[PDB]
Amino acid sequence: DIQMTQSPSTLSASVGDRVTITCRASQSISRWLAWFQKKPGKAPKLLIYTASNLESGVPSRFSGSGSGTEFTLTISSLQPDDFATYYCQQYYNYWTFGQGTKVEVKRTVAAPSVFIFPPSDEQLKSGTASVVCLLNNFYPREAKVQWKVDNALQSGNSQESVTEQDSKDSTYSLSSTLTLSKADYEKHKVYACEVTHQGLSSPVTKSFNRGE
Amino acid sequence: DPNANPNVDPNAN
Amino acid sequence: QVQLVESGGGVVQPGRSLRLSCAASGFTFSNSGMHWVRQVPGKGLEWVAIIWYDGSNKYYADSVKGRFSVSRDNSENTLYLQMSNLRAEDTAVYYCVRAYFDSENLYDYYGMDVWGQGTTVTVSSASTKGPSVFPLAPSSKSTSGGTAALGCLVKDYFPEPVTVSWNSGALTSGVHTFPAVLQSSGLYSLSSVVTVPSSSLGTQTYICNVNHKPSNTKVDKKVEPKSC
Numbered sequence A: 001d002i003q004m005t006q007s008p009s010t011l012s013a014s015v016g017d018r019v020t021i022t023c024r025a026s027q028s029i030s031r032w033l034a035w036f037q038k039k040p041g042k043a044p045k046l047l048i049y050t051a052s053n054l055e056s057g058v059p060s061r062f063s064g065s066g067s068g069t070e071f072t073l074t075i076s077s078l079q080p081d082d083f084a085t086y087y088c089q090q091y092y093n094y095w096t097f098g099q100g101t102k103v104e105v106k107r108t109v110a111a112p113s114v115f116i117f118p119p120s121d122e123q124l125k126s127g128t129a130s131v132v133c134l135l136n137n138f139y140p141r142e143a144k145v146q147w148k149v150d151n152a153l154q155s156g157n158s159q160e161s162v163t164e165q166d167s168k169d170s171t172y173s174l175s176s177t178l179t180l181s182k183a184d185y186e187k188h189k190v191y192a193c194e195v196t197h198q199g200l201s202s203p204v205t206k207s208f209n210r211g212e
Numbered sequence B: 001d002p003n004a005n006p007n008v009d010p011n012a013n
Numbered sequence C: 001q002v003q004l005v006e007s008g009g010g011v012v013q014p015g016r017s018l019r020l021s022c023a024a025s026g027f028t029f030s031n032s033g034m035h036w037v038r039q040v041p042g043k044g045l046e047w048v049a050i051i052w053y054d055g056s057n058k059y060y061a062d063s064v065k066g067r068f069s070v071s072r073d074n075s076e077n078t079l080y081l082q083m084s085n086l087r088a089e090d091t092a093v094y095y096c097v098r099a100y101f102d103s104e105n106l107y108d109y110y111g112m113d114v115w116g117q118g119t120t121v122t123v124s125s126a127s128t129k130g131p132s133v134f135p136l137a138p139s140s141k142s143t144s145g146g147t148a149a150l151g152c153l154v155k156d157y158f159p160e161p162v163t164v165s166w167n168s169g170a171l172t173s174g175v176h177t178f179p180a181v182l183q184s185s186g187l188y189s190l191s192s193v194v195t196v197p198s199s200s201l202g203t204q205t206y207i208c209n210v211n212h213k214p215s216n217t218k219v220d221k222k223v224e225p226k227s228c
Helices: A121-125 A182-186
Strands: A004-007 A010-013 A019-025 A033-038 A045-049 A062-066 A070-075 A084-090 A101-105 A113-117 A128-138 A144-149 A158-162 A172-181 A190-196 A204-209 C003-007 C018-025 C034-039 C045-051 C058-060 C069-073 C078-083 C092-099 C112-115 C119-123 C132-136 C147-157 C163-166 C175-177 C188-197 C207-212 C217-222
Touching: A004 A084, A010 A019, A019 A033, A019 A084, A019 A101, A033 A062, A045 A062, A045 C112, A070 A084, A113 A190, A113 A204, A113 C147, A121 A128, A121 C132, A128 A144, A128 A182, A128 A190, A128 C147, A128 C188, A144 A172, A172 A182, A172 C188, C003 C092, C018 C034, C018 C092, C018 C119, C034 C069, C034 C078, C034 C112, C045 C069, C045 C078, C045 C092, C132 C217, C147 C207, C163 C188
Parallel strands: A010 A101
Antiparallel strands: A004 A019, A019 A070, A033 A045, A033 A084, A062 A070, A084 A101, A113 A128, A128 A172, A144 A190, A158 A172, A190 A204, C003 C018, C018 C078, C034 C045, C034 C092, C045 C058, C069 C078, C092 C112, C092 C119, C132 C147, C147 C188, C163 C207, C175 C188, C207 C217
């Protein structure tokens, strides 16, 4: 079996930039490498085949290079239509894909506005408590969100969800939700969301005491 | 070979 | 235009069977090899199976061998994927994909060219259920520079999707309805939040409208500001 590895996982770029993304095969695949473009919720589109051969209608600004184990895709001058995730695929020994490279829109760093929402009385009546931490309109995507209950870091009891990059302002928003039984929620007092992000010089905490 | 041509043989009899 | 349209996806219980179909048009289906490829939530693209143009040869990924079978009916321009003994790791979008077509057979090794849009298969024992909808009330805590955040938590529904609107569609700017997460219970949950002028909170009502068609449920939740 042959494993394909892409790098970087995400590339921030601007219209007009030269962009290069890399694909490595764990064993030699000669020239049997394809590049696909995929946009959210849409079928992949084949752009390059036989490592360097552009498919019909594919614009001249795309180019593929490589033979053996190291491959690259280059966009000589990025256009708005080119923001997408790119996947390589080897077709020498069955068919396997790289994990993809997301080419996203670059903008200035923007710290998230952070909000915390305690569980509603309506929810507590039913025996579960969800605490929501919201990170609004931030860039870049990378953020670390940790929960502390009575100042103890939590493990295993929270899930995150993130939006696609906003079409107008190029930011992301993110939720982290901590879920506890009503009995566990009532055993503790202090609930805190701690957010680390490049736009913040030190981590920001939003917290409440149960019942205020 | 799984990766060999899986389409009609252009040179079929 | 080469067109591939998958059908047959839906909810299936673990251990059960499900047959997917793909309707091909805009090329000579009987001359093309064909593939199935899937994408499991949170994983990469995974090749599933190939079948020769004439049905004479077929190969599978180790992860489905012995459970999945690929076949075709060239007289009906249809590709099939028969799945059996399904498990949660098979939940995915399944894509019909044409083997790379080359009338001159220039190269010795073959990839794939045109993809369909996919059909979604959800392998779950969960019963159909509409969501509970809880307010995420604005407070002084939710207020940042003349702006307040509020929302609704849309919890414990199955299967996807829900649709969420605010004020019956009159409020759309500043809304983020997050992708759902699958909970360990096997039910989905999401939040929809909106940022609004803090100046409005005393004179404008905010109501989230939640529609879940699989259960025929529609829920409105008024989200009331907190004095704290």
